[PDB]
């Protein structure tokens, strides 16, 4: 109706509504936006001139702007809600979202000798816009820090926006592009204004959350023989001198490894195996050397995690592929050289049925061409691309994991599902940029052409709301016996899981996968 | 809404016009209901007194000083609430269910 | 109730109130940790209750 400094722009909303196949999750947080780079664009670079190896060189710019990132699940779901979701449902996909930004304060702080003081600046503004035409480097989806906090009572700091471009060493080539963010139409807000927009997701396949109750090779009937034959005997038996001969048999219950099958496991690109028990591992540093890397433009890049694979086979739980998994840190984990007990290892073991084990070969093929003179030889397939009749599962999404990623714009792609897990999108949710409008200090009395480098130390805070509507796929199954469910531990504990401790620090005990309920292949 | 700062020994208090407060009522009774235990901190009997609003806290199942599995944790920021600046007001109404007269 | 009163299935709803936290000056370089510094603040006002 009427906006001003005395009225409030918007109301707090955190809620989740469950109706039929829809669930609508809304959230609200409090943010604080500092001034970055003293309002300057800057060329940032790193090159082999220093100690940096040729692989880590980069060239790019760092903008004064800042951006909102809600791309992680736990922003939108309380652990309880996540439990309603993964226990009762096969799959889900987002439909549409809404975004609101309101109740803006802008404050200016000054330093006089040793005293610090902070006072409202009522006339200052902030600038906000969204890129809806995707005309900027899209920097979301790389799993950077700085999303909304999982716990609504936390106040968070908005990250700085920057991007990278083509480089040769530390230098730049001709195609290198430079973007000036002030060059887009944006909306300017004072303390009595608010900002909002809506967005509608394109059709996306449901994320399958479930494990297969069968395995790809066991689809057969155990009771009945096949009518097809296979080559079971190359040589006579029982004789003192055995000669080569041919004989055939029908696949049956006794030998199921020989039966014909319609389908093949998903592709395999091998990882190195590492044991959680230290003593069993080799004594050396093989992490970077023995890692599984892909080579692009004379630059070796570790492949992290890589394509979706089973972490380990039965009773192998102490083993995990080198880089082939997602690893989340526990609360108050060190940044570098953190101990094993400070991190949380995800496990893809649920997909063992459809996909091959990450640390083992895909299969065996014939190397040579046999003769009565020469013996047959076999060979091992470490890397296997796609073949007609392969089926595979994507990687599981976690409560801490990213929701979506932008499918790059290219001539062609193969199954465009982000490797880190999520929903691939041609047109992801537009990224939102925000900046404090610079306010100069006292200019000189005599004209000078040079730009003004002196400004008023300033920052702004406010509220942000995001609301996403999700579509659910109900679970319809005739299974007689009980499912596996996700459940909290019944035994006593010093402190409640997913709750604040004595000091008020919120923490998450373990990652939570999405696959519990079962289906038939 | 006022903000006070400490600079050495001096204390000073000044209005903050843009700050807000958050208010909500639980009408679905989804929180531990802590009223009715006769705690201190109600309105004063005498209208000329200014009073201080008490802090909200609650208890849950325990075994000794530790907590069991059924122990529940509530985050109060997780409810829809109304945010007010110095020019706003808040109100609601309520209707008691039928109750027998108190016999005096 | 043993202390005396009217027992109610649905008593008057309890009312919660809080000051919205306002951060102090954040650092210039991004840091993931939550902001532990705030502006010392309090609020006052009026309250009216009317019972029939």
mmCIF file of C-alpha atoms in Angstrom, chain A residues 156-451:
data_model
loop_
_atom_site.group_PDB
_atom_site.id
_atom_site.type_symbol
_atom_site.label_atom_id
_atom_site.label_comp_id
_atom_site.label_asym_id
_atom_site.label_seq_id
_atom_site.Cartn_x
_atom_site.Cartn_y
_atom_site.Cartn_z
ATOM 1 C CA UNK A 156 25.315 -15.298 6.709
ATOM 2 C CA UNK A 157 27.665 -13.281 4.543
ATOM 3 C CA UNK A 158 27.085 -12.945 0.813
ATOM 4 C CA UNK A 159 29.959 -14.242 -1.342
ATOM 5 C CA UNK A 160 31.887 -12.241 -3.903
ATOM 6 C CA UNK A 161 31.287 -12.746 -7.606
ATOM 7 C CA UNK A 162 34.144 -13.502 -9.970
ATOM 8 C CA UNK A 163 34.767 -15.529 -13.071
ATOM 9 C CA UNK A 164 37.484 -17.099 -15.185
ATOM 10 C CA UNK A 165 38.222 -16.888 -18.885
ATOM 11 C CA UNK A 166 40.538 -18.443 -21.459
ATOM 12 C CA UNK A 167 44.215 -18.274 -20.587
ATOM 13 C CA UNK A 168 47.622 -19.303 -21.822
ATOM 14 C CA UNK A 169 49.776 -19.589 -18.762
ATOM 15 C CA UNK A 170 49.095 -16.565 -16.612
ATOM 16 C CA UNK A 171 48.426 -14.473 -19.718
ATOM 17 C CA UNK A 172 45.224 -13.976 -21.693
ATOM 18 C CA UNK A 173 44.413 -14.801 -25.298
ATOM 19 C CA UNK A 174 42.392 -12.873 -27.847
ATOM 20 C CA UNK A 175 39.067 -14.564 -27.186
ATOM 21 C CA UNK A 176 39.230 -13.649 -23.501
ATOM 22 C CA UNK A 177 36.049 -11.794 -22.609
ATOM 23 C CA UNK A 178 35.431 -9.062 -20.062
ATOM 24 C CA UNK A 179 32.020 -8.317 -18.574
ATOM 25 C CA UNK A 180 31.041 -5.095 -16.824
ATOM 26 C CA UNK A 181 28.177 -5.861 -14.478
ATOM 27 C CA UNK A 182 27.060 -2.237 -14.255
ATOM 28 C CA UNK A 183 26.102 -2.607 -17.898
ATOM 29 C CA UNK A 184 22.845 -4.401 -17.181
ATOM 30 C CA UNK A 185 19.492 -2.878 -16.258
ATOM 31 C CA UNK A 186 19.080 -3.245 -12.521
ATOM 32 C CA UNK A 187 16.704 -2.113 -9.811
ATOM 33 C CA UNK A 188 17.840 0.306 -7.112
ATOM 34 C CA UNK A 189 16.285 -0.002 -3.664
ATOM 35 C CA UNK A 190 16.271 2.167 -0.575
ATOM 36 C CA UNK A 191 15.192 1.030 2.863
ATOM 37 C CA UNK A 192 11.510 1.206 1.928
ATOM 38 C CA UNK A 193 11.609 -1.000 -1.169
ATOM 39 C CA UNK A 194 11.496 -4.714 -1.887
ATOM 40 C CA UNK A 195 12.409 -6.991 -4.770
ATOM 41 C CA UNK A 196 10.907 -10.186 -6.107
ATOM 42 C CA UNK A 197 10.629 -12.425 -9.120
ATOM 43 C CA UNK A 198 9.232 -15.802 -10.087
ATOM 44 C CA UNK A 199 10.650 -18.660 -12.106
ATOM 45 C CA UNK A 200 9.278 -21.833 -13.657
ATOM 46 C CA UNK A 201 11.384 -24.930 -14.168
ATOM 47 C CA UNK A 202 11.403 -26.678 -17.504
ATOM 48 C CA UNK A 203 10.239 -30.276 -17.657
ATOM 49 C CA UNK A 204 12.832 -32.489 -16.009
ATOM 50 C CA UNK A 205 12.752 -36.238 -15.274
ATOM 51 C CA UNK A 206 12.012 -37.201 -11.691
ATOM 52 C CA UNK A 207 15.038 -37.903 -9.581
ATOM 53 C CA UNK A 208 14.809 -41.600 -8.867
ATOM 54 C CA UNK A 209 15.125 -42.229 -5.152
ATOM 55 C CA UNK A 210 15.038 -45.972 -4.545
ATOM 56 C CA UNK A 211 17.158 -49.096 -4.725
ATOM 57 C CA UNK A 212 16.484 -52.014 -7.009
ATOM 58 C CA UNK A 213 15.206 -55.101 -5.241
ATOM 59 C CA UNK A 214 16.740 -57.194 -8.032
ATOM 60 C CA UNK A 215 20.074 -57.191 -9.813
ATOM 61 C CA UNK A 216 20.689 -56.769 -13.502
ATOM 62 C CA UNK A 217 22.000 -60.289 -14.061
ATOM 63 C CA UNK A 218 19.459 -62.106 -11.865
ATOM 64 C CA UNK A 219 16.290 -61.096 -13.758
ATOM 65 C CA UNK A 220 15.893 -64.744 -14.832
ATOM 66 C CA UNK A 221 13.387 -67.297 -13.581
ATOM 67 C CA UNK A 222 15.156 -69.675 -11.170
ATOM 68 C CA UNK A 223 12.821 -72.589 -11.862
ATOM 69 C CA UNK A 224 12.930 -73.016 -15.636
ATOM 70 C CA UNK A 225 15.606 -73.715 -18.229
ATOM 71 C CA UNK A 226 16.238 -71.530 -21.227
ATOM 72 C CA UNK A 227 15.742 -72.995 -24.664
ATOM 73 C CA UNK A 228 18.945 -71.374 -25.923
ATOM 74 C CA UNK A 229 22.292 -73.159 -25.848
ATOM 75 C CA UNK A 230 25.855 -72.146 -25.087
ATOM 76 C CA UNK A 231 29.271 -73.672 -25.704
ATOM 77 C CA UNK A 232 30.054 -75.660 -22.582
ATOM 78 C CA UNK A 233 32.794 -78.045 -23.721
ATOM 79 C CA UNK A 234 35.845 -77.569 -25.909
ATOM 80 C CA UNK A 235 37.474 -80.924 -25.181
ATOM 81 C CA UNK A 236 36.661 -84.539 -24.440
ATOM 82 C CA UNK A 237 36.993 -85.759 -20.865
ATOM 83 C CA UNK A 238 37.609 -89.029 -19.068
ATOM 84 C CA UNK A 239 40.127 -90.199 -21.644
ATOM 85 C CA UNK A 240 43.830 -90.734 -21.174
ATOM 86 C CA UNK A 241 44.309 -88.460 -24.204
ATOM 87 C CA UNK A 242 41.639 -85.820 -24.716
ATOM 88 C CA UNK A 243 40.973 -84.245 -28.107
ATOM 89 C CA UNK A 244 39.210 -81.025 -28.984
ATOM 90 C CA UNK A 245 35.472 -81.336 -29.570
ATOM 91 C CA UNK A 246 32.367 -79.189 -29.357
ATOM 92 C CA UNK A 247 29.462 -79.626 -26.982
ATOM 93 C CA UNK A 248 26.568 -77.482 -25.895
ATOM 94 C CA UNK A 249 24.219 -77.082 -22.966
ATOM 95 C CA UNK A 250 21.133 -75.177 -21.904
ATOM 96 C CA UNK A 251 21.312 -72.492 -19.271
ATOM 97 C CA UNK A 252 19.473 -73.485 -16.140
ATOM 98 C CA UNK A 253 19.159 -72.980 -12.405
ATOM 99 C CA UNK A 254 22.470 -74.685 -11.684
ATOM 100 C CA UNK A 255 24.544 -72.471 -13.978
ATOM 101 C CA UNK A 256 23.081 -68.989 -14.259
ATOM 102 C CA UNK A 257 26.323 -67.327 -15.268
ATOM 103 C CA UNK A 258 26.070 -68.897 -18.710
ATOM 104 C CA UNK A 259 22.548 -67.841 -19.627
ATOM 105 C CA UNK A 260 21.716 -65.316 -22.303
ATOM 106 C CA UNK A 261 20.807 -61.860 -21.048
ATOM 107 C CA UNK A 262 19.188 -58.831 -22.625
ATOM 108 C CA UNK A 263 21.060 -56.032 -20.888
ATOM 109 C CA UNK A 264 24.490 -54.846 -19.773
ATOM 110 C CA UNK A 265 25.810 -52.789 -16.860
ATOM 111 C CA UNK A 266 26.576 -49.111 -17.188
ATOM 112 C CA UNK A 267 29.897 -47.689 -18.329
ATOM 113 C CA UNK A 268 33.058 -48.008 -16.277
ATOM 114 C CA UNK A 269 36.127 -45.785 -15.927
ATOM 115 C CA UNK A 270 38.281 -47.231 -13.203
ATOM 116 C CA UNK A 271 39.314 -45.603 -9.918
ATOM 117 C CA UNK A 272 42.162 -46.459 -7.586
ATOM 118 C CA UNK A 273 41.165 -48.207 -4.367
ATOM 119 C CA UNK A 274 41.949 -46.858 -0.897
ATOM 120 C CA UNK A 275 41.352 -48.539 2.455
ATOM 121 C CA UNK A 276 39.973 -46.648 5.430
ATOM 122 C CA UNK A 277 42.317 -48.722 7.577
ATOM 123 C CA UNK A 278 45.647 -46.990 7.093
ATOM 124 C CA UNK A 279 47.925 -49.989 7.569
ATOM 125 C CA UNK A 280 46.516 -51.846 4.576
ATOM 126 C CA UNK A 281 47.274 -49.039 2.127
ATOM 127 C CA UNK A 282 50.649 -48.850 0.437
ATOM 128 C CA UNK A 283 53.283 -46.676 2.073
ATOM 129 C CA UNK A 284 53.859 -43.779 -0.349
ATOM 130 C CA UNK A 285 52.009 -40.667 -1.476
ATOM 131 C CA UNK A 286 50.029 -41.809 -4.503
ATOM 132 C CA UNK A 287 47.101 -39.407 -4.137
ATOM 133 C CA UNK A 288 47.944 -37.136 -7.058
ATOM 134 C CA UNK A 289 50.163 -39.522 -9.013
ATOM 135 C CA UNK A 290 47.984 -42.631 -8.912
ATOM 136 C CA UNK A 291 44.764 -40.639 -9.183
ATOM 137 C CA UNK A 292 42.368 -40.975 -12.085
ATOM 138 C CA UNK A 293 42.769 -37.921 -14.294
ATOM 139 C CA UNK A 294 41.500 -36.645 -17.616
ATOM 140 C CA UNK A 295 43.757 -34.639 -19.903
ATOM 141 C CA UNK A 296 42.385 -31.486 -21.520
ATOM 142 C CA UNK A 297 44.377 -28.912 -23.496
ATOM 143 C CA UNK A 298 47.772 -30.009 -22.236
ATOM 144 C CA UNK A 299 46.449 -29.661 -18.693
ATOM 145 C CA UNK A 300 45.914 -32.633 -16.408
ATOM 146 C CA UNK A 301 42.711 -32.428 -14.385
ATOM 147 C CA UNK A 302 41.722 -34.871 -11.678
ATOM 148 C CA UNK A 303 38.288 -36.363 -12.355
ATOM 149 C CA UNK A 304 36.202 -35.653 -9.285
ATOM 150 C CA UNK A 305 34.136 -37.711 -8.525
ATOM 151 C CA UNK A 306 33.671 -39.178 -11.969
ATOM 152 C CA UNK A 307 30.760 -41.110 -13.369
ATOM 153 C CA UNK A 308 28.375 -42.878 -11.025
ATOM 154 C CA UNK A 309 29.619 -46.231 -9.759
ATOM 155 C CA UNK A 310 29.169 -48.528 -6.815
ATOM 156 C CA UNK A 311 31.587 -47.542 -4.077
ATOM 157 C CA UNK A 312 32.391 -51.116 -3.070
ATOM 158 C CA UNK A 313 31.075 -54.648 -3.299
ATOM 159 C CA UNK A 314 29.833 -56.838 -0.446
ATOM 160 C CA UNK A 315 31.700 -56.565 2.878
ATOM 161 C CA UNK A 316 34.179 -54.146 1.294
ATOM 162 C CA UNK A 317 32.885 -51.152 3.251
ATOM 163 C CA UNK A 318 36.403 -50.306 4.435
ATOM 164 C CA UNK A 319 37.347 -49.516 0.812
ATOM 165 C CA UNK A 320 36.493 -46.428 -1.202
ATOM 166 C CA UNK A 321 37.625 -45.143 -4.600
ATOM 167 C CA UNK A 322 40.314 -42.502 -4.509
ATOM 168 C CA UNK A 323 38.538 -39.395 -5.788
ATOM 169 C CA UNK A 324 35.359 -41.146 -6.873
ATOM 170 C CA UNK A 325 33.074 -40.118 -3.996
ATOM 171 C CA UNK A 326 31.667 -37.010 -2.372
ATOM 172 C CA UNK A 327 33.277 -36.084 0.939
ATOM 173 C CA UNK A 328 31.563 -33.671 3.319
ATOM 174 C CA UNK A 329 33.275 -32.122 6.315
ATOM 175 C CA UNK A 330 32.037 -32.304 9.867
ATOM 176 C CA UNK A 331 31.316 -29.105 11.741
ATOM 177 C CA UNK A 332 34.498 -27.224 12.645
ATOM 178 C CA UNK A 333 36.667 -29.307 10.339
ATOM 179 C CA UNK A 334 40.070 -27.968 9.373
ATOM 180 C CA UNK A 335 40.470 -26.514 5.909
ATOM 181 C CA UNK A 336 43.622 -28.387 4.902
ATOM 182 C CA UNK A 337 45.070 -31.791 5.774
ATOM 183 C CA UNK A 338 42.036 -32.705 7.849
ATOM 184 C CA UNK A 339 42.035 -36.035 9.637
ATOM 185 C CA UNK A 340 39.837 -38.911 8.502
ATOM 186 C CA UNK A 341 37.640 -38.546 11.579
ATOM 187 C CA UNK A 342 36.793 -34.954 10.605
ATOM 188 C CA UNK A 343 35.052 -35.790 7.316
ATOM 189 C CA UNK A 344 32.008 -37.766 6.232
ATOM 190 C CA UNK A 345 32.234 -40.271 3.384
ATOM 191 C CA UNK A 346 29.202 -40.807 1.197
ATOM 192 C CA UNK A 347 28.542 -44.281 -0.170
ATOM 193 C CA UNK A 348 26.964 -45.206 -3.500
ATOM 194 C CA UNK A 349 26.751 -48.888 -2.519
ATOM 195 C CA UNK A 350 22.998 -48.906 -3.196
ATOM 196 C CA UNK A 351 23.497 -48.981 -6.982
ATOM 197 C CA UNK A 352 25.609 -52.151 -7.025
ATOM 198 C CA UNK A 353 22.853 -53.889 -8.969
ATOM 199 C CA UNK A 354 22.907 -51.747 -12.093
ATOM 200 C CA UNK A 355 26.377 -50.237 -12.039
ATOM 201 C CA UNK A 356 29.841 -51.794 -11.803
ATOM 202 C CA UNK A 357 32.116 -51.423 -8.813
ATOM 203 C CA UNK A 358 34.280 -48.348 -9.210
ATOM 204 C CA UNK A 359 37.550 -50.028 -8.249
ATOM 205 C CA UNK A 360 37.314 -53.122 -10.466
ATOM 206 C CA UNK A 361 37.474 -53.845 -14.173
ATOM 207 C CA UNK A 362 34.443 -53.843 -16.411
ATOM 208 C CA UNK A 363 35.079 -57.267 -17.895
ATOM 209 C CA UNK A 364 37.274 -59.479 -20.043
ATOM 210 C CA UNK A 365 37.736 -59.578 -23.819
ATOM 211 C CA UNK A 366 39.723 -61.715 -26.228
ATOM 212 C CA UNK A 367 43.138 -60.278 -27.040
ATOM 213 C CA UNK A 368 44.360 -62.757 -29.640
ATOM 214 C CA UNK A 369 42.993 -65.113 -32.277
ATOM 215 C CA UNK A 370 43.239 -68.756 -31.294
ATOM 216 C CA UNK A 371 44.609 -71.595 -33.400
ATOM 217 C CA UNK A 372 45.419 -75.241 -32.920
ATOM 218 C CA UNK A 373 48.988 -73.952 -32.666
ATOM 219 C CA UNK A 374 48.459 -70.990 -30.323
ATOM 220 C CA UNK A 375 46.596 -70.628 -27.052
ATOM 221 C CA UNK A 376 43.805 -68.080 -26.589
ATOM 222 C CA UNK A 377 44.583 -64.961 -24.599
ATOM 223 C CA UNK A 378 42.370 -62.604 -22.628
ATOM 224 C CA UNK A 379 42.524 -58.933 -21.781
ATOM 225 C CA UNK A 380 41.034 -56.548 -19.279
ATOM 226 C CA UNK A 381 38.754 -53.582 -19.906
ATOM 227 C CA UNK A 382 39.519 -50.795 -17.460
ATOM 228 C CA UNK A 383 37.646 -48.065 -19.343
ATOM 229 C CA UNK A 384 34.398 -48.811 -21.157
ATOM 230 C CA UNK A 385 32.249 -46.315 -23.020
ATOM 231 C CA UNK A 386 28.585 -46.699 -23.826
ATOM 232 C CA UNK A 387 27.303 -49.719 -25.752
ATOM 233 C CA UNK A 388 23.788 -50.463 -27.005
ATOM 234 C CA UNK A 389 21.777 -52.062 -24.244
ATOM 235 C CA UNK A 390 23.452 -50.473 -21.238
ATOM 236 C CA UNK A 391 21.468 -49.297 -18.243
ATOM 237 C CA UNK A 392 22.746 -47.243 -15.342
ATOM 238 C CA UNK A 393 21.724 -45.206 -12.313
ATOM 239 C CA UNK A 394 22.644 -41.620 -11.585
ATOM 240 C CA UNK A 395 24.439 -40.503 -8.441
ATOM 241 C CA UNK A 396 22.405 -39.977 -5.301
ATOM 242 C CA UNK A 397 21.497 -36.522 -4.031
ATOM 243 C CA UNK A 398 22.219 -35.685 -0.411
ATOM 244 C CA UNK A 399 20.677 -33.253 2.023
ATOM 245 C CA UNK A 400 23.939 -31.302 1.821
ATOM 246 C CA UNK A 401 24.351 -31.691 -1.927
ATOM 247 C CA UNK A 402 23.677 -29.387 -4.852
ATOM 248 C CA UNK A 403 20.204 -29.281 -6.329
ATOM 249 C CA UNK A 404 20.894 -28.421 -9.970
ATOM 250 C CA UNK A 405 23.558 -27.533 -12.495
ATOM 251 C CA UNK A 406 23.502 -25.705 -15.810
ATOM 252 C CA UNK A 407 23.946 -27.992 -18.798
ATOM 253 C CA UNK A 408 26.612 -26.307 -20.935
ATOM 254 C CA UNK A 409 25.463 -24.950 -24.269
ATOM 255 C CA UNK A 410 27.137 -27.157 -26.858
ATOM 256 C CA UNK A 411 26.543 -28.980 -30.114
ATOM 257 C CA UNK A 412 25.959 -32.286 -28.382
ATOM 258 C CA UNK A 413 26.061 -34.059 -25.063
ATOM 259 C CA UNK A 414 25.441 -37.552 -23.766
ATOM 260 C CA UNK A 415 22.892 -38.013 -20.988
ATOM 261 C CA UNK A 416 23.312 -34.705 -19.496
ATOM 262 C CA UNK A 417 23.028 -35.446 -15.795
ATOM 263 C CA UNK A 418 25.518 -33.554 -13.613
ATOM 264 C CA UNK A 419 28.117 -35.859 -12.168
ATOM 265 C CA UNK A 420 27.880 -34.354 -8.708
ATOM 266 C CA UNK A 421 24.182 -35.207 -8.769
ATOM 267 C CA UNK A 422 21.254 -32.951 -9.313
ATOM 268 C CA UNK A 423 18.958 -31.880 -12.097
ATOM 269 C CA UNK A 424 20.583 -30.823 -15.335
ATOM 270 C CA UNK A 425 18.863 -27.760 -16.730
ATOM 271 C CA UNK A 426 19.102 -25.875 -19.997
ATOM 272 C CA UNK A 427 17.758 -22.787 -18.221
ATOM 273 C CA UNK A 428 18.568 -23.014 -14.532
ATOM 274 C CA UNK A 429 17.226 -20.536 -12.011
ATOM 275 C CA UNK A 430 18.710 -17.167 -12.919
ATOM 276 C CA UNK A 431 21.540 -16.001 -10.729
ATOM 277 C CA UNK A 432 20.976 -12.880 -8.665
ATOM 278 C CA UNK A 433 23.529 -10.118 -8.235
ATOM 279 C CA UNK A 434 23.615 -7.415 -5.577
ATOM 280 C CA UNK A 435 25.907 -4.506 -4.724
ATOM 281 C CA UNK A 436 26.084 -1.460 -2.490
ATOM 282 C CA UNK A 437 25.844 1.740 -4.467
ATOM 283 C CA UNK A 438 29.106 3.617 -3.854
ATOM 284 C CA UNK A 439 28.847 6.905 -1.984
ATOM 285 C CA UNK A 440 31.851 9.228 -2.377
ATOM 286 C CA UNK A 441 33.569 11.082 0.412
ATOM 287 C CA UNK A 442 34.135 14.822 0.214
ATOM 288 C CA UNK A 443 35.478 15.697 -3.242
ATOM 289 C CA UNK A 444 38.087 18.448 -3.566
ATOM 290 C CA UNK A 445 36.989 21.997 -4.214
ATOM 291 C CA UNK A 446 38.985 22.281 -7.447
ATOM 292 C CA UNK A 447 38.068 20.107 -10.405
ATOM 293 C CA UNK A 448 40.209 17.070 -11.169
ATOM 294 C CA UNK A 449 39.636 14.561 -13.949
ATOM 295 C CA UNK A 450 40.821 11.486 -12.060
ATOM 296 C CA UNK A 451 38.132 9.214 -10.684
#
